[PDB]
Amino acid sequence: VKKFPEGFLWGVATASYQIEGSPLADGAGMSIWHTFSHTPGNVKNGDTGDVACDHYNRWKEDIEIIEKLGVKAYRFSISWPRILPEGTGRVNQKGLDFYNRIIDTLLEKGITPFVTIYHWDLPFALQLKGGWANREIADWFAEYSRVLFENFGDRVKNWITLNEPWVVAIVGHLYGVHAPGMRDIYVAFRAVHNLLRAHARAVKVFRETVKDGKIGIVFNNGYFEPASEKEEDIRAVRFMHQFNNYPLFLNPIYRGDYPELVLEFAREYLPENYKDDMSEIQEKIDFVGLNYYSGHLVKFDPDAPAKVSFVERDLPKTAMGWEIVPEGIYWILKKVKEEYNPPEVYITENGAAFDDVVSEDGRVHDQNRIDYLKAHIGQAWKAIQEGVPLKGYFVWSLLDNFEWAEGYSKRFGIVYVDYSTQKRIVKDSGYWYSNVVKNNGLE
Template sequence: METYRISIQWSRLIYNFEKCSVNKDAYEFYLNYFKEIKKRKIKLIVNLHHFDTPYEIFKNGGWENKNTIELYLKYAKKCFGLFGDIVDEWATFNEPSANVECQYLYGFHFPKVQDFKRSIQVYFNLMVAHSKTVNYFKTIYPNKKITIIVSINPAYPRSQNKADLQAAEFRNMIFVYFQLNLILKGTLTKQLENFLKQYDLIPQYFLEEFEEIKKAKIDYIALNYYQPSRVKAKETKKIEEKIMPLSFYDYYEWPKRRINPHRGWEIYPQGLYDLAMLIKNEYDNFAWMISENGMGVENEEKFKIEVIINDDYRIEFIEEHLQFLKIAIDQGSNCFGYSLWTFIDCWSWANAFKNRYGIVEYDLENKKTFIKKSGIYISELIKLKSQ
């Protein structure tokens, strides 16, 4: 393994958010953790925010409150000061759009709000916090790298019918270009600007915030890809009390789709190629890596033979995605890395330990780890790469 990405939890490290006071036990825990990774000569990438805004901040408006931007910046500065010498690279946020979707669009995560306008405000504020953090970081570590981890589910239309094409274009405008344009170009698309104005969705902003966004230059972008979105034109047009993204398209099941039966997600490795070409053609072939790609499986212990889980389905998944990624790289895509989600079975915000993603099994009952067949496969793949 060449790189390992982990996150710091804001509310564990800091206990007074205005003063940014440090919890000594948490500091020592993270420092020792980082040292163990560095002992193994693995590049350490530390992410500052993985969905976990402190509850005390939520009580004061969370990311709808502009003050949260400043609190986050204080926290980021504190982390850089505490761990800057040992951390190789930093990330500001993990999947900010997924964070917003789960918290402010679909009500999956606390505070379980379903409001399109509030979600736009929250996302914009997250981007301001990201940009201010990047700009500060570059003043103190001009030779170190910083990124942001973005989840992308490209939308594909049901047909080439105009209405279906418009449905896919709309979803990509909201969930793909909104993210990539702000992060990589520092602007919104004209199409998105017009849409926000038309439906009174423009967030509260200050001109200097857009200046921060334009100035923020990350070193590469980290992309998470799991599955595509399949969309079609709305089947029924009805007057709704409030506008939501699904006011403009419906999902549909592609007849040729392949499904991970253990998780319910579509397996579409070509989406990784299409994503690579999008970055190449629309964003000046910006440097990027796959920071997450993987396969969750429920009740995976049923595939265990003796002490090893025979997860051939995961090996096939990895191979297919790497094949499409190699085609993209051969065609000039500026992709320099691939990280699987995840090294070891991990905990999920919504599903606890139900779905297992690791190439290393974590036995909850005995607190032991066992390499899976996919882990052996990855090990052999790394050996081939190093030859």
């Protein structure tokens, strides 16, 4: 037995571009992911988000699956260009109606909505004016956030500004692997900083508009381990934690500057007077969302892009080639309490990709996933027993979906989607998770 606190929030998570399809229905503007995925070469098999899970039509059914599984919270994102097709200015009522229906249904069924404002589908119109590179996005994003708060904050009270701003900045603008597909280190660090400014401004507006809600922000994290006791391996680890994990953003939010080893690597790429923005950046947040999947062995490496490389290891791995390290989710929960002590934490994503098949017997026997989930939930339970204020846990994902530059080739769902028919088939992991939520814990 591992019982969780009373009221602990068991969740599933999605994102708009990954599941909705119909990216241009009902007056929506193009997003950067529409243009990026329609560009030849950017995404595995030429996949796009044109159809996806077709949630834009099947939304009532999907929520009926959430209700049927007795899952208590649904984390979903809003497509900015469905709401304001040019990014600023004109509000598309039909985009607001689509999300109103999802919000009302969830509340009817007593399911708690957690809204992600930004999960990567920037309006193409704003990308043409620089996107996250342009300091003006702090105003654009505040105006968008304000529209959401005005229209939905009477019913939604749990809000997330940005999903994984490191990935948005660095994978989008330095590695060029995600939209908008750029490779410029100076842009990428201007984007980090603008993401902070935008986040803080949204928080400021939220205090003015939704005087009874809670607002937070979500970070990707890895559990990095050093290759040795060596000279500099423990430092590589230090650097990777500070750059890749929550501190790149929480050092500014909580302490008013970027982390030490980040400024060592990147002071030259950040704007000249970036500190002028840091007191506004410290706008108080109500919680921190941490996402966690894998862990990594890392070494000092004098030839690498940024003095760090990954030493591969012989550990179980998901279809992503990601190492299964369940104790990272404990480590990161302990570390956030230790370093910044936020009042409330949520695990906003945890999950895995495996090559799921439908069996002759009609079922998906994803024991590899049940094992992955059960193990990580156990490590989260542990951190609760050592005082980490963890108030909820969100499985990535309710559905198999468009997995960014991987396309439909990676399945992270607790419900299997057959794309040829759009039929949902609850996987074992999903029936299982249902019982975890019924029992409010393990065994």
